[PDB]
């Protein structure tokens, strides 16, 4: 269905490397923090989101269209910019990776 498209998208997202240390800008977005170790995070963020969740939701049918997958990414980036301070490496990776997704989705379906 739409999994191979999102699969190719995520594969290309993980190919967005940092200019200095060459670390992927998807690093901190791969997984959600443990609720036991970061209880404050989940008290605020109404809709936590990570890459693995988006991938799971494309396989099981929770996300059927690309607008839902794009909307999910937007939420992931909004959560990161809301919880992290401006200028931090996480905030920057959120912006720059968001810049890439915005271009990609306009540049494809």
Curated annotation (Swiss-Prot):
<comment type="function">
    <text>Catalytic component of the chromatin structure-remodeling complex (RSC), which is involved in transcription regulation and nucleosome positioning. RSC is responsible for the transfer of a histone octamer from a nucleosome core particle to naked DNA. The reaction requires ATP and involves an activated RSC-nucleosome intermediate. Remodeling reaction also involves DNA translocation, DNA twist and conformational change.</text>
</comment>
<comment type="similarity">
    <text>Belongs to the SNF2/RAD54 helicase family.</text>
</comment>
<feature type="domain" description="Bromo">
    <location>
        <begin position="8"/>
        <end position="108"/>
    </location>
</feature>
<comment type="subunit">
    <text>Interacts directly with SFH1, CSE4, histones H3, H4 and H2B, and via its N-terminus, with RSC8. Interacts with LDB7, NPL6 and RTT102. Component of the two forms of the RSC complex composed of at least either RSC1 or RSC2, and ARP7, ARP9, LDB7, NPL6, RSC3, RSC30, RSC4, RSC58, RSC6, RSC8, RSC9, SFH1, STH1, HTL1 and probably RTT102. The complexes interact with histone and histone variant components of centromeric chromatin.</text>
</comment>
<protein>
    <recommendedName>
        <fullName>Nuclear protein STH1/NPS1</fullName>
    </recommendedName>
</protein>
